[PDB]
Amino acid sequence: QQKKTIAVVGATGRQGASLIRVAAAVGHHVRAQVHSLKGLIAEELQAIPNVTLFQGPLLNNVPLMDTLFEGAHLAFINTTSQAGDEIAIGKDLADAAKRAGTIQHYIYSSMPDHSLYGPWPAVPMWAPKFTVENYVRQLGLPSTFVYAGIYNNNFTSLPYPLFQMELMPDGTFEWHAPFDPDIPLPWLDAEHDVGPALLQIFKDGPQKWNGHRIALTFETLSPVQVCAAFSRALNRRVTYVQVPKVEIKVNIPVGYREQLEAIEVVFGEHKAPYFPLPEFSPGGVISQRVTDEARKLWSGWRDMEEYAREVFPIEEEANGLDWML
Ligand SMILES: [Cl-]
Ligand SMILES: [Cl-]
Ligand SMILES: [Cl-]
Ligand SMILES: [Cl-]
Ligand SMILES: [Cl-]
Ligand SMILES: [K+]
Ligand SMILES: [K+]
Ligand SMILES: [K+]
Ligand SMILES: [K+]
């Protein structure tokens, strides 16, 4: 059958870019919204024949949304709080897809509202997405919701918050974070694995996935295990250190700081699960693991050890770091 056109919001982001590259390669035409045509990713995607970019802001720009969905049959939507009004943009996009009438399957990248499952605060950049999910669920078009695990490539030795693989004077690495050293966290190789997984959801179809929540995570590892993966990968001493507060070594926008403080409370103080929804956690009885559906969607997923050994050194050198010589 003719590969269907996919409308994408979040094209230059890790999830969108991953989907777009593989989707185009297998024949899908893509209509993607971007803030601006400039940028390494935007310029890269613009050069893919099957991809068409539409520049402009989404905030209060229903016309751009209508244009985006024109002639599209599939949609992958991942919004951001940066411009603010993420909830309004999410609803506007959903309504726009419905109005188009041609969208057969709408995939929205959602996150949990932790305040619904315990004496925990809602993580500011996550909870809003769940509100959009609830709204999307009530629209007449088939929809599926994917929950992204922590990006393997968040790790960097640059002084950025939460996921810094700090290079010490002796050449060893230390990762400091509020997470409990031994509680398994959900991870994800966004660049390589998000795209293939999303395409399989699209290939499976709306009858199989309408109304479903899928955890896009292929590997769970505690912080100590992540560091052990880097250690084996790099042949260097890498150790995890639990800290009460996130070490914020650089200036960050106010919204991110609030995101980090919520994280300190949720994972630091409370040790709550990353994915707190109940569905995410006798002879022959076998309970579903959080990584089961994702692995079934895409069997060629890559682990943390592969990232640390094969990609981390390149990304680091690309950022100007020198430890890899
Ligand atoms: Cl298709
Ligand atoms: Cl098109
Ligand atoms: Cl532009
Ligand atoms: Cl479909
Ligand atoms: Cl540092
Ligand atoms: K193009
Ligand atoms: K529905
Ligand atoms: K309705
Ligand atoms: K997500």
mmCIF file of C-alpha atoms and ligand atoms in Angstrom:
data_model
loop_
_atom_site.group_PDB
_atom_site.id
_atom_site.type_symbol
_atom_site.label_atom_id
_atom_site.label_comp_id
_atom_site.label_asym_id
_atom_site.label_seq_id
_atom_site.Cartn_x
_atom_site.Cartn_y
_atom_site.Cartn_z
ATOM 1 C CA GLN A 1 0.000 0.000 0.000
ATOM 2 C CA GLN A 2 1.070 3.585 -0.647
ATOM 3 C CA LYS A 3 3.051 4.942 2.362
ATOM 4 C CA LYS A 4 0.938 7.587 4.090
ATOM 5 C CA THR A 5 1.941 11.178 4.712
ATOM 6 C CA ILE A 6 2.849 11.989 8.299
ATOM 7 C CA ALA A 7 2.338 15.426 9.880
ATOM 8 C CA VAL A 8 4.939 16.138 12.527
ATOM 9 C CA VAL A 9 5.234 18.764 15.221
ATOM 10 C CA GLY A 10 8.524 18.593 17.076
ATOM 11 C CA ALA A 11 10.498 17.841 13.895
ATOM 12 C CA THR A 12 13.854 19.201 15.090
ATOM 13 C CA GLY A 13 13.463 17.591 18.512
ATOM 14 C CA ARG A 14 14.984 14.166 19.169
ATOM 15 C CA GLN A 15 11.739 12.198 18.828
ATOM 16 C CA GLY A 16 10.516 13.994 15.714
ATOM 17 C CA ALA A 17 13.861 13.957 13.933
ATOM 18 C CA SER A 18 14.287 10.230 14.628
ATOM 19 C CA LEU A 19 10.861 9.457 13.151
ATOM 20 C CA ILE A 20 11.300 11.747 10.164
ATOM 21 C CA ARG A 21 14.617 10.274 9.040
ATOM 22 C CA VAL A 22 13.460 6.654 9.069
ATOM 23 C CA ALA A 23 9.933 7.491 7.833
ATOM 24 C CA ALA A 24 11.274 9.296 4.756
ATOM 25 C CA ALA A 25 13.728 6.481 4.018
ATOM 26 C CA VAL A 26 10.864 3.945 3.842
ATOM 27 C CA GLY A 27 8.712 6.088 1.562
ATOM 28 C CA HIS A 28 6.590 8.300 3.789
ATOM 29 C CA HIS A 29 6.094 11.904 2.733
ATOM 30 C CA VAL A 30 6.414 14.191 5.747
ATOM 31 C CA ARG A 31 4.908 17.595 6.496
ATOM 32 C CA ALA A 32 6.763 19.121 9.444
ATOM 33 C CA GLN A 33 6.373 22.381 11.321
ATOM 34 C CA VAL A 34 9.557 24.151 12.445
ATOM 35 C CA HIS A 35 10.066 27.459 14.208
ATOM 36 C CA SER A 36 12.641 28.438 11.577
ATOM 37 C CA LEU A 37 14.290 26.839 8.559
ATOM 38 C CA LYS A 38 17.756 27.621 10.002
ATOM 39 C CA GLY A 39 19.573 25.148 12.238
ATOM 40 C CA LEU A 40 21.518 21.956 11.639
ATOM 41 C CA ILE A 41 18.493 19.700 12.082
ATOM 42 C CA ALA A 42 16.069 21.852 10.106
ATOM 43 C CA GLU A 43 18.577 22.216 7.255
ATOM 44 C CA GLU A 44 19.280 18.491 7.415
ATOM 45 C CA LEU A 45 15.597 17.536 7.270
ATOM 46 C CA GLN A 46 14.851 20.085 4.545
ATOM 47 C CA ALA A 47 17.392 18.245 2.359
ATOM 48 C CA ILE A 48 15.489 14.938 2.598
ATOM 49 C CA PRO A 49 13.408 14.737 -0.615
ATOM 50 C CA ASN A 50 10.232 13.341 1.012
ATOM 51 C CA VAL A 51 10.230 16.042 3.701
ATOM 52 C CA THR A 52 8.491 19.407 3.439
ATOM 53 C CA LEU A 53 8.976 21.988 6.188
ATOM 54 C CA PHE A 54 6.513 24.718 7.164
ATOM 55 C CA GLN A 55 8.135 27.493 9.206
ATOM 56 C CA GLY A 56 6.397 29.682 11.728
ATOM 57 C CA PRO A 57 5.200 29.653 15.346
ATOM 58 C CA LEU A 58 2.363 27.334 16.417
ATOM 59 C CA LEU A 59 1.205 29.596 19.247
ATOM 60 C CA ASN A 60 -2.077 31.106 18.031
ATOM 61 C CA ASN A 61 -1.433 30.050 14.458
ATOM 62 C CA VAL A 62 -4.280 27.699 13.603
ATOM 63 C CA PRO A 63 -3.718 28.447 9.886
ATOM 64 C CA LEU A 64 -0.237 26.884 10.044
ATOM 65 C CA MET A 65 -1.776 23.883 11.773
ATOM 66 C CA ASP A 66 -4.417 23.525 9.054
ATOM 67 C CA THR A 67 -1.687 23.702 6.401
ATOM 68 C CA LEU A 68 0.391 21.108 8.265
ATOM 69 C CA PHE A 69 -2.388 18.506 8.359
ATOM 70 C CA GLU A 70 -3.500 19.081 4.775
ATOM 71 C CA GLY A 71 -3.260 15.787 2.913
ATOM 72 C CA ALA A 72 -1.785 13.992 5.942
ATOM 73 C CA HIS A 73 -3.119 10.606 7.103
ATOM 74 C CA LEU A 74 -0.869 10.052 10.150
ATOM 75 C CA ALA A 75 0.414 12.411 12.826
ATOM 76 C CA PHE A 76 3.117 12.405 15.473
ATOM 77 C CA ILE A 77 2.909 15.279 17.919
ATOM 78 C CA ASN A 78 5.517 16.234 20.526
ATOM 79 C CA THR A 79 5.045 19.737 21.931
ATOM 80 C CA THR A 80 7.192 21.917 24.154
ATOM 81 C CA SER A 81 6.583 24.420 26.967
ATOM 82 C CA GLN A 82 9.245 26.865 25.700
ATOM 83 C CA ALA A 83 6.762 29.176 23.937
ATOM 84 C CA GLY A 84 4.333 28.622 26.784
ATOM 85 C CA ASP A 85 0.712 27.644 26.218
ATOM 86 C CA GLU A 86 1.645 24.029 25.547
ATOM 87 C CA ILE A 87 -1.859 22.945 26.594
ATOM 88 C CA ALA A 88 -3.560 25.385 24.220
ATOM 89 C CA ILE A 89 -1.230 24.435 21.362
ATOM 90 C CA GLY A 90 -1.872 20.742 22.036
ATOM 91 C CA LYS A 91 -5.646 21.185 21.903
ATOM 92 C CA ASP A 92 -5.432 23.446 18.874
ATOM 93 C CA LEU A 93 -3.360 20.823 17.017
ATOM 94 C CA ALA A 94 -5.745 18.029 17.988
ATOM 95 C CA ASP A 95 -8.765 20.037 16.765
ATOM 96 C CA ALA A 96 -6.878 20.868 13.562
ATOM 97 C CA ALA A 97 -6.137 17.176 12.889
ATOM 98 C CA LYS A 98 -9.786 16.336 13.480
ATOM 99 C CA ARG A 99 -10.926 19.130 11.138
ATOM 100 C CA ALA A 100 -8.640 17.801 8.421
ATOM 101 C CA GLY A 101 -10.697 14.612 8.485
ATOM 102 C CA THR A 102 -7.860 12.625 6.903
ATOM 103 C CA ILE A 103 -5.853 11.780 10.024
ATOM 104 C CA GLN A 104 -6.375 8.068 10.661
ATOM 105 C CA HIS A 105 -3.966 7.731 13.618
ATOM 106 C CA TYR A 106 -2.760 10.503 15.927
ATOM 107 C CA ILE A 107 0.239 9.744 18.151
ATOM 108 C CA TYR A 108 0.789 12.217 20.968
ATOM 109 C CA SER A 109 3.965 12.218 23.067
ATOM 110 C CA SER A 110 2.653 12.394 26.627
ATOM 111 C CA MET A 111 4.040 12.343 30.159
ATOM 112 C CA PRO A 112 2.621 11.661 33.665
ATOM 113 C CA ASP A 113 1.090 14.018 36.215
ATOM 114 C CA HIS A 114 2.688 12.535 39.350
ATOM 115 C CA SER A 115 0.291 14.383 41.668
ATOM 116 C CA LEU A 116 -2.405 11.886 40.636
ATOM 117 C CA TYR A 117 -0.608 8.860 42.051
ATOM 118 C CA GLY A 118 0.848 9.906 45.396
ATOM 119 C CA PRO A 119 1.758 12.727 47.819
ATOM 120 C CA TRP A 120 3.931 14.069 45.025
ATOM 121 C CA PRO A 121 4.055 17.334 43.051
ATOM 122 C CA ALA A 122 3.289 17.378 39.356
ATOM 123 C CA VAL A 123 6.495 17.779 37.346
ATOM 124 C CA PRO A 124 5.816 21.135 35.548
ATOM 125 C CA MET A 125 6.946 20.180 32.034
ATOM 126 C CA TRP A 126 5.222 16.783 32.162
ATOM 127 C CA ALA A 127 1.799 17.188 33.765
ATOM 128 C CA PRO A 128 0.575 19.628 31.056
ATOM 129 C CA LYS A 129 1.037 16.874 28.439
ATOM 130 C CA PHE A 130 -1.293 14.553 30.326
ATOM 131 C CA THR A 131 -3.962 17.251 30.165
ATOM 132 C CA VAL A 132 -3.573 17.309 26.380
ATOM 133 C CA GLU A 133 -3.750 13.500 26.307
ATOM 134 C CA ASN A 134 -7.113 13.523 28.121
ATOM 135 C CA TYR A 135 -8.368 16.101 25.636
ATOM 136 C CA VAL A 136 -7.112 14.121 22.628
ATOM 137 C CA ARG A 137 -8.804 10.964 23.949
ATOM 138 C CA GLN A 138 -12.210 12.637 23.570
ATOM 139 C CA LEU A 139 -11.760 13.508 19.912
ATOM 140 C CA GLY A 140 -13.273 11.191 17.324
ATOM 141 C CA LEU A 141 -9.948 10.246 15.701
ATOM 142 C CA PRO A 142 -7.930 7.193 16.768
ATOM 143 C CA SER A 143 -5.060 8.240 19.038
ATOM 144 C CA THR A 144 -2.145 6.570 20.814
ATOM 145 C CA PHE A 145 0.055 8.013 23.549
ATOM 146 C CA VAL A 146 3.769 7.367 23.882
ATOM 147 C CA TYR A 147 5.733 8.012 27.061
ATOM 148 C CA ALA A 148 9.427 8.638 26.385
ATOM 149 C CA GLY A 149 12.027 7.246 28.733
ATOM 150 C CA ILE A 150 15.085 9.263 29.736
ATOM 151 C CA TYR A 151 17.274 10.019 26.691
ATOM 152 C CA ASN A 152 20.559 8.154 26.716
ATOM 153 C CA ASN A 153 22.128 11.130 24.999
ATOM 154 C CA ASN A 154 21.192 13.579 27.711
ATOM 155 C CA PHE A 155 24.611 12.598 29.067
ATOM 156 C CA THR A 156 27.414 15.063 28.451
ATOM 157 C CA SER A 157 30.510 16.232 30.318
ATOM 158 C CA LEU A 158 29.451 19.859 29.678
ATOM 159 C CA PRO A 159 28.243 21.458 32.980
ATOM 160 C CA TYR A 160 24.546 21.012 32.207
ATOM 161 C CA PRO A 161 22.031 19.998 34.912
ATOM 162 C CA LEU A 162 21.007 16.523 35.996
ATOM 163 C CA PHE A 163 22.752 14.351 33.397
ATOM 164 C CA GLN A 164 26.351 15.464 33.607
ATOM 165 C CA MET A 165 29.027 12.783 33.263
ATOM 166 C CA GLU A 166 31.573 14.980 35.015
ATOM 167 C CA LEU A 167 35.173 14.344 33.950
ATOM 168 C CA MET A 168 37.319 14.505 37.073
ATOM 169 C CA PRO A 169 40.971 15.653 37.260
ATOM 170 C CA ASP A 170 42.206 12.052 37.324
ATOM 171 C CA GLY A 171 40.341 11.130 34.161
ATOM 172 C CA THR A 172 37.527 9.334 35.972
ATOM 173 C CA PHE A 173 33.826 10.118 35.507
ATOM 174 C CA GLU A 174 31.174 10.869 38.111
ATOM 175 C CA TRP A 175 27.438 11.313 37.621
ATOM 176 C CA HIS A 176 25.713 13.253 40.397
ATOM 177 C CA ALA A 177 21.890 13.269 40.643
ATOM 178 C CA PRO A 178 18.981 13.121 43.170
ATOM 179 C CA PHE A 179 17.809 9.725 41.876
ATOM 180 C CA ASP A 180 18.139 6.776 44.236
ATOM 181 C CA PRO A 181 21.310 4.831 43.352
ATOM 182 C CA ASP A 182 19.462 1.540 43.013
ATOM 183 C CA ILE A 183 15.965 2.235 41.674
ATOM 184 C CA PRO A 184 15.762 1.289 37.951
ATOM 185 C CA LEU A 185 14.963 4.197 35.616
ATOM 186 C CA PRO A 186 13.525 3.955 32.089
ATOM 187 C CA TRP A 187 16.029 4.782 29.326
ATOM 188 C CA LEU A 188 15.779 5.463 25.607
ATOM 189 C CA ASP A 189 18.144 5.825 22.634
ATOM 190 C CA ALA A 190 16.042 8.542 20.983
ATOM 191 C CA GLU A 191 18.096 8.993 17.826
ATOM 192 C CA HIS A 192 18.015 5.346 16.813
ATOM 193 C CA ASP A 193 14.984 3.831 18.481
ATOM 194 C CA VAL A 194 12.114 6.317 18.642
ATOM 195 C CA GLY A 195 11.618 6.463 14.879
ATOM 196 C CA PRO A 196 11.371 2.695 14.212
ATOM 197 C CA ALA A 197 9.077 2.218 17.222
ATOM 198 C CA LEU A 198 6.695 4.982 16.113
ATOM 199 C CA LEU A 199 6.590 3.601 12.583
ATOM 200 C CA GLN A 200 5.582 0.178 13.927
ATOM 201 C CA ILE A 201 2.737 1.766 15.857
ATOM 202 C CA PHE A 202 1.649 3.346 12.563
ATOM 203 C CA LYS A 203 2.044 0.038 10.694
ATOM 204 C CA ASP A 204 0.106 -1.913 13.338
ATOM 205 C CA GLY A 205 -2.741 0.562 12.884
ATOM 206 C CA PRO A 206 -5.415 2.401 14.960
ATOM 207 C CA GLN A 207 -7.594 -0.622 15.735
ATOM 208 C CA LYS A 208 -4.730 -2.211 17.629
ATOM 209 C CA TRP A 209 -3.464 0.946 19.368
ATOM 210 C CA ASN A 210 -6.366 3.406 19.772
ATOM 211 C CA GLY A 211 -6.592 4.605 23.382
ATOM 212 C CA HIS A 212 -3.334 2.923 24.401
ATOM 213 C CA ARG A 213 -0.404 4.275 26.396
ATOM 214 C CA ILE A 214 2.985 2.892 25.326
ATOM 215 C CA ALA A 215 6.189 3.381 27.294
ATOM 216 C CA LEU A 216 8.912 4.160 24.761
ATOM 217 C CA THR A 217 11.720 2.627 26.801
ATOM 218 C CA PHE A 218 13.801 -0.386 25.829
ATOM 219 C CA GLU A 219 16.012 -0.689 28.882
ATOM 220 C CA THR A 220 15.661 -0.011 32.593
ATOM 221 C CA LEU A 221 18.849 0.675 34.566
ATOM 222 C CA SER A 222 19.478 2.080 38.027
ATOM 223 C CA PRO A 223 21.929 5.017 38.175
ATOM 224 C CA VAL A 224 24.584 2.652 39.500
ATOM 225 C CA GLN A 225 23.995 0.280 36.561
ATOM 226 C CA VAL A 226 24.139 3.178 34.060
ATOM 227 C CA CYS A 227 27.560 4.149 35.449
ATOM 228 C CA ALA A 228 28.660 0.516 35.256
ATOM 229 C CA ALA A 229 27.629 0.576 31.581
ATOM 230 C CA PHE A 230 29.737 3.681 30.936
ATOM 231 C CA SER A 231 32.626 2.136 32.876
ATOM 232 C CA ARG A 232 32.595 -1.042 30.756
ATOM 233 C CA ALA A 233 32.135 1.008 27.588
ATOM 234 C CA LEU A 234 34.931 3.528 28.189
ATOM 235 C CA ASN A 235 37.320 1.395 30.265
ATOM 236 C CA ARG A 236 37.323 4.167 32.851
ATOM 237 C CA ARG A 237 36.152 4.482 36.431
ATOM 238 C CA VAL A 238 32.608 5.881 36.371
ATOM 239 C CA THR A 239 30.661 6.234 39.594
ATOM 240 C CA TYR A 240 27.253 7.476 40.702
ATOM 241 C CA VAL A 241 26.817 9.910 43.588
ATOM 242 C CA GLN A 242 23.393 10.670 45.016
ATOM 243 C CA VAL A 243 22.921 14.353 45.827
ATOM 244 C CA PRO A 244 19.884 15.960 47.524
ATOM 245 C CA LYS A 245 19.851 18.900 45.125
ATOM 246 C CA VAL A 246 20.510 18.968 41.399
ATOM 247 C CA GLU A 247 23.866 20.640 40.831
ATOM 248 C CA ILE A 248 23.007 23.660 38.659
ATOM 249 C CA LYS A 249 26.341 24.876 37.320
ATOM 250 C CA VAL A 250 25.040 27.063 34.490
ATOM 251 C CA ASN A 251 22.246 29.581 34.025
ATOM 252 C CA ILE A 252 18.923 28.036 32.970
ATOM 253 C CA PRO A 253 15.513 29.491 32.131
ATOM 254 C CA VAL A 254 13.191 29.796 35.151
ATOM 255 C CA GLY A 255 10.855 27.132 33.807
ATOM 256 C CA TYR A 256 13.607 24.508 33.763
ATOM 257 C CA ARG A 257 14.705 25.332 37.311
ATOM 258 C CA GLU A 258 11.152 24.670 38.509
ATOM 259 C CA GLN A 259 11.206 21.422 36.530
ATOM 260 C CA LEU A 260 14.418 20.379 38.324
ATOM 261 C CA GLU A 261 13.100 21.297 41.790
ATOM 262 C CA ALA A 262 10.021 19.124 41.190
ATOM 263 C CA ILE A 263 12.359 16.324 40.166
ATOM 264 C CA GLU A 264 14.323 16.739 43.434
ATOM 265 C CA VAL A 265 11.075 16.304 45.370
ATOM 266 C CA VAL A 266 9.658 13.443 43.286
ATOM 267 C CA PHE A 267 12.764 11.282 42.797
ATOM 268 C CA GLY A 268 15.087 12.696 45.439
ATOM 269 C CA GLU A 269 12.793 12.980 48.435
ATOM 270 C CA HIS A 270 10.038 10.529 47.470
ATOM 271 C CA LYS A 271 11.755 7.967 45.214
ATOM 272 C CA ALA A 272 8.598 7.854 43.076
ATOM 273 C CA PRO A 273 8.551 5.898 39.792
ATOM 274 C CA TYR A 274 9.426 7.717 36.579
ATOM 275 C CA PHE A 275 6.233 6.305 35.024
ATOM 276 C CA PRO A 276 3.732 6.256 37.974
ATOM 277 C CA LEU A 277 0.667 5.105 36.041
ATOM 278 C CA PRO A 278 -0.545 1.747 37.397
ATOM 279 C CA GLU A 279 -0.195 0.110 33.977
ATOM 280 C CA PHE A 280 3.521 0.910 34.000
ATOM 281 C CA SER A 281 3.944 -0.951 37.337
ATOM 282 C CA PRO A 282 1.408 -19.616 39.852
ATOM 283 C CA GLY A 283 3.249 -21.768 37.319
ATOM 284 C CA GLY A 284 3.472 -20.103 33.923
ATOM 285 C CA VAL A 285 2.350 -16.681 35.174
ATOM 286 C CA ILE A 286 4.452 -13.840 33.737
ATOM 287 C CA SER A 287 3.911 -10.153 34.468
ATOM 288 C CA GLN A 288 4.464 -7.580 31.696
ATOM 289 C CA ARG A 289 7.673 -5.520 32.119
ATOM 290 C CA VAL A 290 7.596 -1.824 31.234
ATOM 291 C CA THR A 291 9.929 -2.495 28.268
ATOM 292 C CA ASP A 292 7.891 -5.323 26.690
ATOM 293 C CA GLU A 293 5.700 -3.433 24.193
ATOM 294 C CA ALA A 294 8.506 -1.161 23.024
ATOM 295 C CA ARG A 295 10.821 -4.119 22.394
ATOM 296 C CA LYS A 296 8.032 -5.855 20.488
ATOM 297 C CA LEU A 297 7.609 -2.746 18.301
ATOM 298 C CA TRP A 298 11.327 -2.474 17.563
ATOM 299 C CA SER A 299 13.654 -5.416 18.237
ATOM 300 C CA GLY A 300 16.785 -3.637 17.037
ATOM 301 C CA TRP A 301 17.003 -1.260 19.997
ATOM 302 C CA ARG A 302 20.403 -0.159 21.382
ATOM 303 C CA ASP A 303 21.472 -0.158 25.033
ATOM 304 C CA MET A 304 23.335 2.283 27.281
ATOM 305 C CA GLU A 305 26.635 0.430 26.900
ATOM 306 C CA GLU A 306 26.461 0.847 23.094
ATOM 307 C CA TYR A 307 25.703 4.536 23.467
ATOM 308 C CA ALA A 308 28.581 5.187 25.892
ATOM 309 C CA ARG A 309 31.080 3.296 23.739
ATOM 310 C CA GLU A 310 30.011 4.215 20.213
ATOM 311 C CA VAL A 311 28.207 7.546 20.290
ATOM 312 C CA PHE A 312 29.095 9.392 23.505
ATOM 313 C CA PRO A 313 32.764 9.856 22.461
ATOM 314 C CA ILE A 314 31.711 11.387 19.124
ATOM 315 C CA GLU A 315 29.053 13.708 20.607
ATOM 316 C CA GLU A 316 31.571 14.785 23.219
ATOM 317 C CA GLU A 317 34.265 15.537 20.620
ATOM 318 C CA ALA A 318 31.633 17.360 18.532
ATOM 319 C CA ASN A 319 30.965 19.548 21.608
ATOM 320 C CA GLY A 320 34.662 20.359 21.806
ATOM 321 C CA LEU A 321 35.615 18.038 24.661
ATOM 322 C CA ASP A 322 39.108 16.455 24.684
ATOM 323 C CA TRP A 323 39.208 13.534 27.116
ATOM 324 C CA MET A 324 38.824 11.078 24.199
ATOM 325 C CA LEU A 325 41.995 12.540 22.682
HETATM 326 CL CL CL B 1 1.609 3.927 5.797
HETATM 327 CL CL CL B 2 3.149 16.453 1.528
HETATM 328 CL CL CL B 3 12.332 30.672 8.687
HETATM 329 CL CL CL B 4 -3.848 4.218 9.728
HETATM 330 CL CL CL B 5 31.779 20.695 35.938
HETATM 331 K K K B 6 12.757 18.277 1.058
HETATM 332 K K K B 7 -11.213 8.794 20.729
HETATM 333 K K K B 8 -15.890 14.330 20.649
HETATM 334 K K K B 9 6.729 11.300 25.979
#
